[PDB]
Design a protein around this motif. Structure first.
Motif, short mmCIF file in Angstrom:
data_model
loop_
_atom_site.label_atom_id
_atom_site.label_comp_id
_atom_site.label_asym_id
_atom_site.label_seq_id
_atom_site.Cartn_x
_atom_site.Cartn_y
_atom_site.Cartn_z
N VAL A 57 -6.65 1.60 -5.17
CA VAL A 57 -7.65 0.57 -4.91
C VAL A 57 -7.02 -0.83 -4.85
O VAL A 57 -6.46 -1.32 -5.84
CB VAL A 57 -8.78 0.56 -5.98
CG1 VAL A 57 -9.76 -0.54 -5.69
CG2 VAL A 57 -9.50 1.91 -6.04
N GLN A 58 -7.11 -1.48 -3.70
CA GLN A 58 -6.64 -2.85 -3.57
C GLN A 58 -7.53 -3.82 -4.38
O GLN A 58 -8.75 -3.67 -4.45
CB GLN A 58 -6.54 -3.28 -2.10
CG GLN A 58 -5.51 -4.40 -1.82
CD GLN A 58 -6.02 -5.78 -2.22
OE1 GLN A 58 -7.23 -6.03 -2.23
NE2 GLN A 58 -5.10 -6.68 -2.57
N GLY A 59 -6.88 -4.81 -5.00
CA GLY A 59 -7.59 -5.81 -5.79
C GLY A 59 -6.66 -6.88 -6.30
O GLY A 59 -5.52 -6.60 -6.71
N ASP A 60 -7.13 -8.12 -6.25
CA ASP A 60 -6.47 -9.26 -6.85
C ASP A 60 -7.22 -9.49 -8.15
O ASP A 60 -8.43 -9.75 -8.13
CB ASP A 60 -6.60 -10.47 -5.90
CG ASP A 60 -5.98 -11.75 -6.46
OD1 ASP A 60 -5.89 -11.89 -7.70
OD2 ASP A 60 -5.61 -12.64 -5.65
N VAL A 61 -6.52 -9.37 -9.29
CA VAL A 61 -7.18 -9.50 -10.60
C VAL A 61 -7.66 -10.93 -10.90
O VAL A 61 -8.50 -11.11 -11.77
CB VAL A 61 -6.32 -8.99 -11.81
CG1 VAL A 61 -5.99 -7.51 -11.67
CG2 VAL A 61 -5.06 -9.84 -12.00
N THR A 62 -7.13 -11.92 -10.18
CA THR A 62 -7.65 -13.30 -10.31
C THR A 62 -9.00 -13.46 -9.60
O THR A 62 -9.72 -14.41 -9.86
CB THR A 62 -6.69 -14.36 -9.77
OG1 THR A 62 -6.57 -14.25 -8.34
CG2 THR A 62 -5.31 -14.24 -10.40
N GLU A 87 0.80 -1.23 0.00
CA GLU A 87 0.00 0.00 0.00
C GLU A 87 0.83 1.29 0.00
O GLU A 87 0.45 2.26 -0.65
CB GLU A 87 -0.98 0.00 1.17
CG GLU A 87 -2.06 1.06 1.08
CD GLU A 87 -2.84 1.25 2.39
OE1 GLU A 87 -2.74 0.39 3.30
OE2 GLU A 87 -3.57 2.27 2.49
N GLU A 88 1.96 1.30 0.72
CA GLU A 88 2.81 2.49 0.76
C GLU A 88 3.56 2.72 -0.55
O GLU A 88 3.99 3.82 -0.85
CB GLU A 88 3.75 2.50 1.98
CG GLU A 88 5.00 1.62 1.89
CD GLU A 88 5.87 1.70 3.15
OE1 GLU A 88 5.37 2.11 4.23
OE2 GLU A 88 7.07 1.35 3.07
N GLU A 89 3.69 1.64 -1.33
CA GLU A 89 4.20 1.73 -2.69
C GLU A 89 3.15 2.37 -3.59
O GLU A 89 3.44 3.28 -4.36
CB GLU A 89 4.54 0.34 -3.18
CG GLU A 89 5.22 0.29 -4.51
CD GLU A 89 6.04 -0.96 -4.66
OE1 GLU A 89 7.26 -0.82 -4.91
OE2 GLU A 89 5.49 -2.08 -4.51
N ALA A 90 1.91 1.89 -3.45
CA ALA A 90 0.78 2.42 -4.20
C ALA A 90 0.57 3.90 -3.90
O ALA A 90 0.31 4.69 -4.82
CB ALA A 90 -0.47 1.62 -3.89
#
Ligand SMILES: NC(=O)C1=CN([C@@H]2O[C@H](COP(=O)(O)OP(=O)(O)OC[C@H]3O[C@@H](n4cnc5c(N)ncnc54)[C@H](O)[C@@H]3O)[C@@H](O)[C@H]2O)C=CC1
Ligand SMILES: NC(=O)C1=CN([C@@H]2O[C@H](COP(=O)(O)OP(=O)(O)OC[C@H]3O[C@@H](n4cnc5c(N)ncnc54)[C@H](O)[C@@H]3O)[C@@H](O)[C@H]2O)C=CC1
Ligand SMILES: NC(=O)C1=CN([C@@H]2O[C@H](COP(=O)(O)OP(=O)(O)OC[C@H]3O[C@@H](n4cnc5c(N)ncnc54)[C@H](O)[C@@H]3O)[C@@H](O)[C@H]2O)C=CC1
Ligand SMILES: NC(=O)C1=CN([C@@H]2O[C@H](COP(=O)(O)OP(=O)(O)OC[C@H]3O[C@@H](n4cnc5c(N)ncnc54)[C@H](O)[C@@H]3O)[C@@H](O)[C@H]2O)C=CC1
Ligand SMILES: OC[C@H]1O[C@@H](O)[C@H](O)[C@@H](O)[C@@H]1O
Ligand SMILES: OC[C@H]1O[C@@H](O)[C@H](O)[C@@H](O)[C@@H]1O
Ligand SMILES: OC[C@H]1O[C@@H](O)[C@H](O)[C@@H](O)[C@@H]1O
Ligand SMILES: OC[C@H]1O[C@@H](O)[C@H](O)[C@@H](O)[C@@H]1O
Ligand SMILES: [Cl-]
Ligand SMILES: [Cl-]
Lengths: 262, 267, 263, 267
Positions: free
Chosen positions: B68-73, B48-51
């Protein structure tokens, strides 16, 4: 028979009891091969296919298998090795399709086609190649692609995607295993007279429409694809690996640009 | 402040979603769309701190940005990403499916688990992303734009990376199909195909000076690509400068697809 | 002020620069404040009109007569650009011709005219520009005007298709050969565009709609949409892009007959 | 007499014209078609004795052969060839445009004359041949067959051989066009794409042991192809086994087009 080098070769064919898989099985039977017919669920149909191979001059067994299940694909190859003593040619032919506007396509429906068409072929290919590598056999793999590894196909984005992946999968495997003499190739059929097209070809307007998209003017007979398979599987194709050999009556050449249109 | 001219004036205030947007090519794209005064949605997996660091840069470059956090799978994460963008910014203009992974395994030793993680991430996640955006574009009569981050390996086979090669080859036919299916709506769908680029996916590889040299020896132009060279391409493709361009794969590869070993008339 | 600041004062040579895509590119490079050398076959007044458009758009321009099937005309063209503007930065080989003939009835002379203009012309132009770039350590740029018919076969236009198919491998070869020197060589592949090459075809309303029916995006391209691609390729934005064909075709290479799940 | 089996029964008594039929790939095809009991018209440039030897081999393998001198750059010579095949054997069934030339020249140094020799021989020559065969096929309602000898270099770019590469890329689109144009009449048109083959075109190159090994290192299957391996593909393509096959390039290249540098997971 035509390809003498194919006699006594062990050839596994997923979806080998209908349409293209069965024409292939029969043709390898005509070449005096030992055919392993995988089938999903219609055992009575697989037995008829088994009979046809034997009648044609070969040997045949039938093995139930779901190509989306890893254990099933492992079983399928193991059985060929146990029953006939070796493996020579692996043919990943099983595939499915269905029309859905792309933005409406469900993940489950997408997955079914990818898993069957692409991952199914990966598993088959991996198991065959593992055996060839472990045993120094200059084996062969034939993956059944489609003109739709090249021709995009609206409403069938899952199918097109599965065949596009199959292309790079085949080409990759061919490159990786070429130094061991293991050949890996796709066949890309055009519109063929098989069960996958049964409902479509029943309608005389839709059948006429498909034909208008085939420059040679006729829907392909399954034995025309089986001929391609026998060539690729044989030592006639000794220097041929990593290719997609299209059998399509000119489909990939853009049928709408006939007569200098555009 | 509007103290500098920007290249693609039509990109100003466009809503651009970028999966894997916090690192490598995704971040370079995020930053570039910011430079054009776009509203960037930076998707990230875990750091998140990278984002947030990337969101900072998008803002400092002249754009607006949310993370926005998300796993594309994960299907609901993809639906959530697209939904968040429409809720927060009012619309969606450009979908960039950029998340991807790779790892080397001799193909006869590649596990279904490993194959599946690469196919699901690289290919299926791009389908989900694409599907969600095109769904929105269609229901609103928006002439939207999808960019899928392919590779030279939608054309170049890749021993030890059969899953990655297959995923990119699938993306080609997926993209080409969507392009054809949705062209009559003016929705454009295109791939970018980078060659070797200086990003985290290659960091371990490039730390080793012999391997770094080996990879460079496979690039006809003779240098590993800078991430902004790829973002330049996305900016172009997303813009109305590429109005007649759909269904293509634009390789930015320093000539990699041209067969590096056949230089000098070898063969 | 303009889009690609790096294109300012770049010397850009364009064969067929007085009509159609050539003219659209010339004007566009003029908008980028470049120095445009408009090559033309034999319509001097049209070339003068085009020169006036470049200047008004904000560039400089000269016109130079030359038949691209004549080696000395191509040599002269590149030499003229260097003498007048001081250097050469971008070589655009855009001149081309076509006509329909059943292949089994196509004359050798006709074959040759299309091959020599479309392909050998672009070779000569490419060779002269690269020779200059190499002798003078310049990181120059070559753009060859191909077509969707470097990929889409074209009954009745076999000479044309063959010319563009050759151009593809020519461009890709040169791009590979000269990449280590920082010289980029790329093709543009346009679909159906509104230009004089299609004037007679598009004056016929049935043919016009027939062509439009083969464009998935639904419209005949405007020349400016191709010129936008040329400006992008010539510019430093495309620094890592070489050896490609950038189709600008509204989806034509995607197989228009396969729309709606036909097949 | 039919005292030995052969593979393709439908090739028996078929009339097959082969340009450059007296050496290398042309000769291997001539012989293989002889093994199939075909009637072979061996076209040759200037070495009459070599052509007569090839004629003898064809006869010994089980076929009929005549030799016809002809320069494929000369329209009248190509017209003569087809007319001589038709006069001597009564018909024409398979046209094989195989003659080709190459030489290495840095591209910015390559003369118009040298460019034209390669283009005229390799591309234009193949056009004239294909035109004359197809003209005959169309006038007489024959479902004839055309095989053009292309190369991996219709796909693999080739610095120092830009003329050769253009000629083969041109051949690709010529062949694909003709195949589309005449498919409704059942005339099939295909290319063969050989990789590095052991023939006189590569003789000087292969007599140099370091170039020989260097070329071998670029072939994933690890060996310079034997000419009969291409002959096998030609036999296949010419037969009714390939009844549904038209417009294709069948690469027989030991994996060359699969990008030899990306082996072992490099790049
Ligand atoms: N017939 C045509 O027009 C063309 C089809 N081909 C391809 O040829 C292949 C064979 O299809 P056709 O013979 O045409 O029709 P088909 O529908 O008769 O054959 C498909 C076969 O795969 C089997 N199968 C499906 N799911 C399976 C699973 N999970 N596990 C094991 N087997 C499963 C089916 O039971 C059936 O035997 C397919 O891969 C298809 O994509 C591609 C080009 C043209
Ligand atoms: N950099 C290169 O050399 C090349 C990479 N590209 C592609 O560009 C894309 C981005 O890679 P790079 O920026 O180079 O390296 P990277 O590894 O820094 O970028 C990949 C991004 O995807 C994210 N990601 C991984 N799994 C995810 C998941 N399940 N859900 C959501 N996000 C996930 C990672 O967090 C990361 O931000 C990839 O699709 C890769 O295939 C392809 C061609 C060349
Ligand atoms: N308009 C279209 O739909 C498309 C055309 N393009 C290509 O665009 C290029 C330009 O054509 P358009 O602008 O479309 O039509 P156009 O006919 O206006 O342009 C052709 C230009 O080349 C010039 N030219 C012809 N022979 C020449 C010679 N021997 N020496 C010097 N110049 C000569 C003509 O005078 C003319 O200016 C051609 O290379 C064509 O192949 C290709 C794809 C699409
Ligand atoms: N050997 C190889 O590695 C490969 C060569 N092939 C192609 O195979 C074809 C045959 O070459 P190879 O048998 O390998 O070498 P080769 O040099 O023995 O064969 C070429 C033949 O073409 C004839 N020829 C040349 N110019 C002619 C003209 N103007 N008129 C009539 N005949 C002419 C020569 O007399 C000779 O018989 C060529 O088209 C070549 O490009 C392409 C791919 C690989
Ligand atoms: O479009 C030609 C054919 O492509 C194949 O891959 C499909 O299975 C057929 O249903 C279709 O007719
Ligand atoms: O082969 C060139 C590049 O291809 C990309 O798709 C991969 O992500 C990189 O790891 C690799 O360096
Ligand atoms: O590079 C592979 C081969 O390509 C062929 O087309 C050439 O004729 C050969 O000289 C070369 O060895
Ligand atoms: O087929 C699309 C277009 O291709 C171009 O190369 C031709 O010049 C045009 O006349 C044609 O409309
Ligand atoms: Cl390579
Ligand atoms: Cl089409």
């Amino acid at each position: 028979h035509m390809y003498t080098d194919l006699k006594d070769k062990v050839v596994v064919i997923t979806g080998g009891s209908t349409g293209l898989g069965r024409a292939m099985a029969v043709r390898f039977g005509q070449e005096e091969a030992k055919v392993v017919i995988n089938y999903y669920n219609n055992e009575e149909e697989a037995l008829d296919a088994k009979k046809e191979v034997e009648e044609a001059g070969g040997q045949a067994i039938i093995v139930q298998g779901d190509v989306t299940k890893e254990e099933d694909v492992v079983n399928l190859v193991q059985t060929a090795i146990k029953e006939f003593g070796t493996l020579d040619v692996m043919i990943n032919n099983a595939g499915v399709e269905n029309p859905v506007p792309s933005h409406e396509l469900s993940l489950d429906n997408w997955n079914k086609v990818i898993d069957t068409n692409l991952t199914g072929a990966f598993l088959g290919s991996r198991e065959a190649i593992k055996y060839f590598v472990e045993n120094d056999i200059k084996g062969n793999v034939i993956n059944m692609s489609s003109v739709h590894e090249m021709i995009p196909w609206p409403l069938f984005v899952h199918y097109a995607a599965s065949k596009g992946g199959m292309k790079l999968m085949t080409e990759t495997l061919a490159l990786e295993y070429a130094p061991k003499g293991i050949r890996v190739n796709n066949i890309g059929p055009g519109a063929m007279n098989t069960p996958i097209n049964a409902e479509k070809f029943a309608d005389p307007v839709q059948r006429a429409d498909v034909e208008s998209m085939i420059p040679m003017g006729y829907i392909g007979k399954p034995e025309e694809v089986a001929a391609v398979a026998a060539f690729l599987a044989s030592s006639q194709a000794s220097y041929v690996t990593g290719i997609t050999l299209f059998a399509d009556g000119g489909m990939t050449k853009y049928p709408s640009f006939q007569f200098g249109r555009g």
